C-alpha cells in the first residue's frame, strides 16, 4: 500500500448517500483550532451523522479512516454529497509551520491517492463533474446548495499555502 492509514475508528453505521458512481474526492479542514486527529476520530465515531460526516482525517503525522469510501457522505451540505467518493479533513490545531507541513504533505498525497483509487482526475476545483473539489468549490457550484463553507482555503492561507499553490500541489504532487 502507498500510505499507512489507521482504520481503528472506521465507523460501520453510516448511511449511503446517492448511488455509485461517485465522481468527486472532497478536500476539507475541520474548523477546530484545538482538536487532535484522535479527538476528531473519536468525535466522528460518536456524533450524530446528521451533523455531517466524512471518510478521512489527517493530523499529527497520521491518517485515520473514519468513514467508508465510495458510498457518498453528508460532507458538503448540498447535492454533491451524492458525489463523495471520499471526504478528507485536515486538522487546524497546528502550533508551528513544521507541524502543519508534516500533515499538509500527507493531505496532498492522500487526496491524490484517493482520486487514483477512484479512477478520478487528479485536478483541483475544475469545471468538470469529476475530480478533487474543495468544500469552497462545492458550496459555490453544487446543485441544491445549503452550505456557506469555504474550507480548506482560509486554513491553508494561515500557514502560507495559496489557492494557486494548493492547486499546483494537488495536480503535480510534492
Ligand atoms: Zn468542509
Curated annotation (Swiss-Prot):
It is an enzyme of class 3 (hydrolase). One of its GO terms (biological process) is cell wall organization. It is found in: Secreted. The keyword Ubl conjugation does not apply. The keyword Cell wall biogenesis/degradation applies. GO terms for molecular function: N-acetylmuramoyl-L-alanine amidase activity. Keywords: Cell wall biogenesis/degradation, Competence, Hydrolase, Repeat, Secreted, Sporulation. It catalyses: Hydrolyzes the link between N-acetylmuramoyl residues and L-amino acid residues in certain cell-wall glycopeptides. It comes from the Bacteria. Residues 21-153 form the N-acetylmuramoyl-L-alanine amidase domain. GO terms for cellular component: extracellular region. Its main location: secreted. Its EC number is 3.5.1.28. Belongs to the N-acetylmuramoyl-L-alanine amidase 2 family. The C-terminal domain could be responsible for the substrate recognition. Autolysins are involved in some important biological processes such as cell separation, cell-wall turnover, competence for genetic transformation, formation of the flagella and sporulation. Autolysin strictly depends on the presence of choline-containing cell walls for activity. This is Autolysin.
